[PDB]
Protein backbone atom coordinates (compact mmCIF):
# COMPACT_ATOMS: atom_id res chain seq x y z
CA UNK A 1 0.00 0.00 0.00
CA UNK A 2 2.00 2.96 -1.32
CA UNK A 3 1.82 6.60 -0.31
CA UNK A 4 3.19 9.98 -1.31
CA UNK A 5 4.97 11.89 1.44
CA UNK A 6 7.18 14.94 1.77
CA UNK A 7 10.10 12.60 2.51
CA UNK A 8 9.44 10.35 -0.50
CA UNK A 9 9.35 13.42 -2.73
CA UNK A 10 12.74 14.32 -1.27
CA UNK A 11 14.06 10.81 -1.94
CA UNK A 12 12.97 11.10 -5.57
CA UNK A 13 13.74 14.71 -6.45
CA UNK A 14 16.85 15.19 -4.27
CA UNK A 15 18.44 11.85 -3.34
CA UNK A 16 18.02 9.80 -6.54
CA UNK A 17 18.44 12.89 -8.72
CA UNK A 18 21.72 13.82 -7.01
CA UNK A 19 23.20 10.33 -6.99
CA UNK A 20 22.27 9.62 -10.62
CA UNK A 21 24.38 12.59 -11.70
CA UNK A 22 27.49 11.31 -9.93
CA UNK A 23 30.29 9.92 -12.10
CA UNK A 24 30.41 6.78 -9.88
CA UNK A 25 26.70 5.95 -10.12
CA UNK A 26 26.61 4.06 -13.45
CA UNK A 27 27.28 0.50 -12.13
CA UNK A 28 24.11 0.96 -10.07
CA UNK A 29 21.73 2.14 -12.80
CA UNK A 30 20.54 -1.38 -13.66
CA UNK A 31 20.28 -4.74 -11.88
CA UNK A 32 23.53 -6.70 -11.77
CA UNK A 33 23.46 -9.22 -14.66
CA UNK A 34 25.53 -12.04 -13.19
CA UNK A 35 25.63 -14.10 -16.39
CA UNK A 36 26.58 -11.25 -18.74
CA UNK A 37 29.27 -10.04 -16.32
CA UNK A 38 30.72 -13.48 -15.39
CA UNK A 39 29.71 -13.41 -11.70
CA UNK A 40 28.68 -17.06 -11.24
CA UNK A 41 28.18 -16.99 -7.42
CA UNK A 42 26.42 -13.61 -7.34
CA UNK A 43 22.86 -14.81 -6.74
CA UNK A 44 24.13 -17.46 -4.31
CA UNK A 45 25.42 -14.60 -2.13
CA UNK A 46 23.08 -11.74 -3.06
CA UNK A 47 19.52 -12.94 -2.53
CA UNK A 48 17.94 -9.46 -2.31
CA UNK A 49 19.31 -7.62 -5.36
CA UNK A 50 18.69 -3.90 -5.60
CA UNK A 51 19.79 -1.08 -7.90
CA UNK A 52 19.10 2.62 -8.27
CA UNK A 53 17.00 2.19 -11.42
CA UNK A 54 14.63 -0.05 -9.49
CA UNK A 55 14.55 2.45 -6.61
CA UNK A 56 13.81 5.28 -9.05
CA UNK A 57 10.92 3.41 -10.68
CA UNK A 58 9.56 2.48 -7.24
CA UNK A 59 9.46 6.16 -6.27
CA UNK A 60 7.99 7.14 -9.65
CA UNK A 61 5.14 4.64 -9.17
CA UNK A 62 4.45 5.35 -5.47
CA UNK A 63 5.59 1.87 -4.46
CA UNK A 64 6.68 2.95 -0.97
CA UNK A 65 4.55 3.68 2.06
CA UNK A 66 7.41 5.55 3.76
CA UNK A 67 10.83 6.97 2.91
CA UNK A 68 12.23 4.55 5.50
CA UNK A 69 11.49 1.74 3.04
CA UNK A 70 13.25 3.63 0.27
CA UNK A 71 16.28 4.23 2.51
CA UNK A 72 16.31 0.48 3.25
CA UNK A 73 16.49 -0.26 -0.49
CA UNK A 74 19.45 2.13 -0.81
CA UNK A 75 21.12 0.38 2.11
CA UNK A 76 20.53 -2.98 0.44
CA UNK A 77 22.04 -1.67 -2.79
CA UNK A 78 25.18 -0.37 -1.06
CA UNK A 79 25.66 -3.33 1.29
CA UNK A 80 25.10 -5.88 -1.51
CA UNK A 81 28.07 -4.24 -3.20
CA UNK A 82 30.09 -4.23 0.06
CA UNK A 83 29.45 -7.96 0.60
CA UNK A 84 29.87 -9.41 -2.86
CA UNK A 85 33.00 -7.52 -3.79
CA UNK A 86 36.32 -7.62 -2.10
CA UNK A 87 37.13 -5.07 0.61
CA UNK A 88 39.62 -3.17 -1.63
CA UNK A 89 37.86 -3.27 -5.02
CA UNK A 90 37.27 0.01 -6.84
CA UNK A 91 33.53 -0.60 -6.97
CA UNK A 92 33.46 -0.73 -3.15
CA UNK A 93 35.20 2.66 -2.96
CA UNK A 94 32.71 4.00 -5.51
CA UNK A 95 29.81 2.67 -3.46
CA UNK A 96 31.30 4.21 -0.32
CA UNK A 97 31.55 7.60 -2.03
CA UNK A 98 27.93 7.39 -3.18
CA UNK A 99 26.81 6.31 0.28
CA UNK A 100 28.58 9.32 1.77
CA UNK A 101 26.53 11.60 -0.49
CA UNK A 102 23.40 9.57 0.25
CA UNK A 103 23.86 10.10 3.99
CA UNK A 104 24.59 13.80 3.48
CA UNK A 105 21.29 14.17 1.62
CA UNK A 106 19.31 12.10 4.12
CA UNK A 107 20.56 14.43 6.86
CA UNK A 108 18.85 17.40 5.14
CA UNK A 109 15.58 15.51 4.60
CA UNK A 110 12.47 16.84 6.38
CA UNK A 111 12.61 14.94 9.66
CA UNK A 112 8.81 14.61 9.94
CA UNK A 113 7.04 12.49 7.32
CA UNK A 114 3.64 13.79 6.20
CA UNK A 115 1.38 12.48 3.45
CA UNK A 116 0.68 15.02 0.72
CA UNK B 1 66.80 -3.63 -25.94
CA UNK B 2 66.33 0.13 -25.58
CA UNK B 3 67.90 3.43 -24.56
CA UNK B 4 67.00 6.85 -23.18
CA UNK B 5 65.87 9.56 -25.57
CA UNK B 6 64.40 13.01 -25.06
CA UNK B 7 61.22 11.86 -26.80
CA UNK B 8 60.89 8.71 -24.69
CA UNK B 9 61.43 10.74 -21.52
CA UNK B 10 58.66 13.01 -22.79
CA UNK B 11 56.39 10.03 -23.46
CA UNK B 12 56.94 8.82 -19.90
CA UNK B 13 56.83 12.01 -17.85
CA UNK B 14 54.35 14.02 -19.96
CA UNK B 15 52.18 11.75 -22.09
CA UNK B 16 51.79 8.67 -19.88
CA UNK B 17 51.82 10.59 -16.62
CA UNK B 18 48.98 12.79 -17.93
CA UNK B 19 46.96 9.97 -19.47
CA UNK B 20 47.36 7.76 -16.39
CA UNK B 21 45.67 10.40 -14.20
CA UNK B 22 42.77 10.94 -16.61
CA UNK B 23 39.28 9.99 -15.43
CA UNK B 24 38.77 7.65 -18.44
CA UNK B 25 42.14 5.85 -18.46
CA UNK B 26 41.32 2.98 -16.10
CA UNK B 27 39.99 0.46 -18.72
CA UNK B 28 43.45 0.70 -20.33
CA UNK B 29 45.65 0.11 -17.26
CA UNK B 30 45.96 -3.66 -17.85
CA UNK B 31 45.89 -6.13 -20.76
CA UNK B 32 42.41 -7.19 -21.76
CA UNK B 33 41.91 -10.53 -19.97
CA UNK B 34 39.45 -12.30 -22.24
CA UNK B 35 38.91 -15.09 -19.69
CA UNK B 36 38.13 -13.00 -16.61
CA UNK B 37 36.10 -10.54 -18.70
CA UNK B 38 34.20 -13.24 -20.65
CA UNK B 39 35.30 -12.05 -24.12
CA UNK B 40 35.42 -15.30 -26.12
CA UNK B 41 35.98 -13.55 -29.48
CA UNK B 42 38.57 -10.99 -28.34
CA UNK B 43 41.70 -12.83 -29.44
CA UNK B 44 39.98 -13.98 -32.62
CA UNK B 45 39.51 -10.31 -33.53
CA UNK B 46 42.59 -8.67 -31.91
CA UNK B 47 45.98 -10.16 -32.85
CA UNK B 48 48.27 -7.45 -31.40
CA UNK B 49 46.98 -6.56 -27.91
CA UNK B 50 48.28 -3.49 -26.13
CA UNK B 51 47.47 -1.52 -22.98
CA UNK B 52 48.78 1.53 -21.16
CA UNK B 53 50.17 -0.47 -18.24
CA UNK B 54 52.39 -2.38 -20.66
CA UNK B 55 53.47 0.89 -22.31
CA UNK B 56 54.24 2.46 -18.93
CA UNK B 57 56.28 -0.58 -17.86
CA UNK B 58 58.16 -0.53 -21.16
CA UNK B 59 59.12 3.11 -20.61
CA UNK B 60 60.24 2.47 -17.02
CA UNK B 61 62.33 -0.56 -18.08
CA UNK B 62 63.90 1.28 -21.06
CA UNK B 63 62.37 -1.31 -23.39
CA UNK B 64 61.88 1.14 -26.24
CA UNK B 65 64.60 2.22 -28.66
CA UNK B 66 62.61 5.11 -30.14
CA UNK B 67 59.52 7.07 -29.19
CA UNK B 68 58.05 6.00 -32.55
CA UNK B 69 57.57 2.60 -30.96
CA UNK B 70 55.77 4.05 -27.95
CA UNK B 71 53.49 6.15 -30.16
CA UNK B 72 52.62 3.10 -32.27
CA UNK B 73 51.82 1.06 -29.15
CA UNK B 74 49.33 3.79 -28.16
CA UNK B 75 47.88 3.73 -31.69
CA UNK B 76 47.51 -0.05 -31.51
CA UNK B 77 45.86 0.16 -28.09
CA UNK B 78 43.28 2.70 -29.23
CA UNK B 79 42.68 1.07 -32.62
CA UNK B 80 42.10 -2.35 -31.05
CA UNK B 81 39.42 -0.82 -28.87
CA UNK B 82 37.63 0.65 -31.89
CA UNK B 83 37.92 -2.64 -33.82
CA UNK B 84 36.52 -4.79 -31.01
CA UNK B 85 33.77 -2.57 -29.59
CA UNK B 86 30.72 -0.85 -31.02
CA UNK B 87 31.00 2.85 -31.90
CA UNK B 88 28.22 3.47 -29.36
CA UNK B 89 30.04 1.74 -26.48
CA UNK B 90 31.15 4.04 -23.67
CA UNK B 91 34.63 2.49 -23.77
CA UNK B 92 35.03 3.82 -27.33
CA UNK B 93 34.04 7.35 -26.31
CA UNK B 94 36.56 7.09 -23.46
CA UNK B 95 39.23 5.95 -25.91
CA UNK B 96 38.41 8.93 -28.16
CA UNK B 97 38.85 11.43 -25.32
CA UNK B 98 42.15 9.85 -24.29
CA UNK B 99 43.42 9.73 -27.85
CA UNK B 100 42.77 13.45 -28.33
CA UNK B 101 44.87 14.26 -25.26
CA UNK B 102 47.56 11.86 -26.48
CA UNK B 103 47.79 13.60 -29.84
CA UNK B 104 47.78 17.02 -28.16
CA UNK B 105 50.87 16.09 -26.15
CA UNK B 106 52.48 14.39 -29.15
CA UNK B 107 52.19 17.64 -31.11
CA UNK B 108 54.27 19.42 -28.44
CA UNK B 109 56.92 16.69 -28.05
CA UNK B 110 60.50 17.62 -29.03
CA UNK B 111 60.60 17.16 -32.78
CA UNK B 112 64.15 15.76 -33.09
CA UNK B 113 64.92 12.58 -31.14
CA UNK B 114 68.33 12.47 -29.42
CA UNK B 115 69.85 9.92 -27.08
CA UNK B 116 70.20 10.88 -23.42
Author numbering:
A (entry chain B), B (entry chain A): 32 to 147
Lines quoted from the article behind this entry:
Bromodomains (BDs) regulate gene expression by recognizing protein motifs containing acetyllysine. BDs are small alpha-helical bundles found in ∼40 human proteins that mainly regulate gene expression. These domains harbor a deep pocket that specifically recognizes AcK-containing peptide motifs in both histones and other gene regulatory proteins such as transcription factors. To begin to address this knowledge gap in an unbiased manner, we carried out mRNA display screens against a BD—the N-terminal BD of BRD3—using peptide libraries that contained either one or two acetyllysine residues.
Because of the limited solubility of the original peptides, we synthesized analogs that incorporated two glutamates at both the N- and C-termini of each peptide to improve solubility and facilitate further characterization of the peptide–BD interactions. The glutamates thus improved solubility at the expense of affinity. Two copies of BRD3–BD1 bind a single peptide. The acetyl group of AcK6 forms the same hydrogen bond with the side chain of Asn116 that is common to all characterized BD–peptide interactions. In the second BD, the hydroxyl group of Tyr12 forms a water-mediated hydrogen bond also to Asn116 (inset). Instead, Leu7 and Leu11 form contact with the WPF shelf of the AcK6-binding BD. These residues, together with Leu8, simultaneously interact with the WPF shelf of the second BD. Finally, we note that side chains of residues N terminal to AcK6 were either not in contact with the BD or did not display any electron density, suggesting that they were likely not well ordered.
